[PDB]
Each structure stands twice: as C-alpha cells, then as structure tokens.
C-alpha cells in the first residue's frame, strides 16, 4: 500500500522500483550504455491484445484491461528491445521485455495461476 514507505530505505512505488530493477537487469543483459534516459509510454489495453492468446483462454485476462508501461530510447530501439510492466488494479501482472518479434517474460500471471516467475533474476 505504501511501497515507498514499507521498506527500510526510501524507495518509489512498486512500479518504479520494479522499473529500476528491470533496468539494472536489462543494462547488464544487453550491455546498455544508459547514456540517455528511459522514456515511458503508458497505455491501457485489453490483455487479449497485448499478451499471447495461449495465456488468455478462459482466465480473468480474457476481459481485464491492463495498465501498461513500455520504456524506450534510441538505444533500446536500436536493439529492438522494449522493457514493459503490466498491472491490473494495483496488482502486478507482468514483467518482461519485447525482444524483436518475441515477448520475453520475467514474471507473468493471470491473477489465478502464475505462468512464469523468474524475479529471482532481478534481485
């Protein structure tokens, strides 16, 4: 509820803290300069339009509209990678990054069955 004030040290929201974690992981995985800032494109969209159909099915994602955060700059555009976060009513739905035509997942759930959880790679 107060992720900023629920730890020992000062931090931001769950979204922004998870962003920084995703950023430190992607910087190492892709040898990123981070010479430019991560600009963010925020958008709400039905889960069935932004996630593979295999994970939708008759799960709650069939109807859910997710709040999405896609980070970008000219360096990430050069590598064709787009780190993204997805939420649904303050609950984390997905951590990952688009890699060219693929969609890599570091975390993904349908609010009932966790599909992927590799957040251990982020901490």
């Amino acid at each position: 509820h107060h992720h900023h004030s629920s730890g020992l040290v000062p931090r931001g929201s769950h979204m922004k803290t998870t962003t920084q974690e995703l950023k430190q992981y992607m910087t190492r995985l892709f040898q990123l300069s981070n010479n430019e800032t991560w600009e963010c494109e925020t958008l709400e969209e039905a889960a069935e339009n932004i996630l593979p159909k295999r994970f939708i099915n008759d799960s709650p994602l069939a109807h859910l509209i997710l709040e999405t955060y896609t980070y970008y700059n000219n360096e990430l555009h050069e590598l064709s990678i787009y780190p993204f976060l997805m939420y649904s009513n303050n609950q984390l739905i997905s951590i990952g990054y688009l890699d060219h035509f693929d969609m890599d997942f570091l975390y993904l759930t349908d609010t009932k069955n966790t599909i992927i959880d590799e957040r251990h790679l982020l901490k």
């Binding site: 430019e36 800032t37 600009e39 963010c40 494109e41 925020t42 958008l43 709400e44 969209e45 039905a46 339009n49 932004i50 509209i65 709040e67 999405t68 955060y69 896609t70 970008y72 700059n73 000219n74 555009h77 787009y82 993204f84 688009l98 035509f101």
Partner: protein, 216 residues
C-alpha cells in the same frame, strides 16, 4: 457549429470549478504537461467544422519536451515514441510516404482531431490527473462531434477507445477500429489495418476531400 458553443453547452451540464482550482494549484506547484496554453491545442488547430477524422488518445506524455496538446504527437526535438513509430511505419506501408517529423499538427490542420481522453498530467506520474473531470468533458466532446457533424471517421485504436462506441451514432459515422499501435499490440491487428486509406475512402464516399497524411 463552433467549439465555443459546445464548450458552453458542456459547462451548463457540469460544474468545473473544483477542477479549475485543482489545475491552477497544480500548475503553480508542480510541473504539469502539456503547457497551460497547449491544453486545448487539438481544438484550436482543428475547428469543429473542419473535423474529418477523430483519433482518440488516452493520457498525455508525462516526460519533458513531449506532450503539446495533441494525441500521440510530440514536440519536434523529442525522441519518437514507439506507438508513433509504428503509426508512421503503417502510414508508409499504407499511403506510401515516410514522415520524418514527430509532430502531427499538419494532421490537425487537415481535419484530424487528435483528442486525448485526459488532457493534463503531472511530470512522470501516469494517470495523475485522472478522475478530475477530463473524462466527462471528452465524452461530451465525442457526443457533440457525433451529433453536430453529418459524417466523420472515428479511428479507435485499442479497447479503451473502442469503449466510446456507445457515444457515437454508428449509423452516421464510420468507425475504424483495431488493436493499439503500441509495440505490445501492433502485430496483433494494427500493421496492415490501413486506417489512413480507409478513412480517406470513406471521406470520398461521403463527398469530402481526403486527408493529406504525408508531410508538406
């Protein structure tokens, strides 16, 4: 019909005083986007009688040197957002021209109402000015466009924009809908959808000159 009369008709139906005090405090205390004099740029650049196409956005960009009052558009020195990149790619694959500037003011002059559903935002805080009155105002704007124009094109990208079909008289106006041009969804419906040429085809079928989507 003028934007001023529609705005007044809206003010008769909804009180915007608390919203005014909030926005004044916000602009005085924090960094609000876009600039104050650019809040209604979509209306200033697209007078009501010039509306041929309506493209709905959501929130303005919340980073420096980005939003300037138009949906999807960014300032000339800004880095290209991914959705705008995919819009330009689909334009190249659809009409045949490549756009090099990241602003869409010429689209606005041509008659494309680039309407965000929320018109202000605090710097770096997504949805910070949600649920303060912008939704009611933009819903009424959509209703007024549907009422006081004979035939226009609504380009509805994404599910939230498609939820506004309830406000549009589908018997009068063309509705072009697909998934969002965002890289998260562009390959599930947007690429190949050809919204620009479809809009121009409808405009010519209703006796109106087409949109020049290209640069000039």
């Amino acid at each position: 019909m003028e934007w001023s009369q529609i705005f007044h008709d809206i003010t008769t139906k909804h009180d915007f005083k608390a919203m005014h005090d909030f926005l004044e405090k916000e602009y005085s205390t924090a960094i609000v986007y876009p600039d104050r004099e650019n809040i209604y740029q979509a209306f200033d650049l697209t007078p009501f009688e010039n509306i041929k196409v309506v493209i709905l956005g959501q929130d303005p960009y919340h980073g420096p040197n980005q939003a300037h009052g138009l949906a999807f558009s960014v300032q000339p020195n800004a880095k290209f957002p991914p959705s705008l990149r995919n819009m330009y790619k689909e334009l190249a694959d659809d009409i045949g021209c490549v756009r090099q500037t990241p602003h869409l003011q010429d689209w606005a002059r041509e008659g494309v109402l680039l309407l965000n559903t929320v018109l202000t935002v605090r710097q770096g805080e997504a949805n910070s000015h949600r649920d303060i009155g912008w939704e009611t105002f933009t819903d009424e704007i959509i209703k007024a466009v549907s009422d006081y124009k004979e035939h226009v094109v609504f380009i509805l990208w994404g599910k939230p924009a498609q939820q506004k079909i309830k406000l549009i008289d589908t018997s009068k106006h063309c509705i072009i809908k697909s998934v969002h041009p965002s890289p998260l969804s562009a390959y599930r419906g947007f690429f190949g959808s050809k919204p620009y040429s479809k809009a121009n085809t409808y405009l010519e079928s209703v006796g109106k000159s087409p949109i020049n989507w290209c640069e000039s």
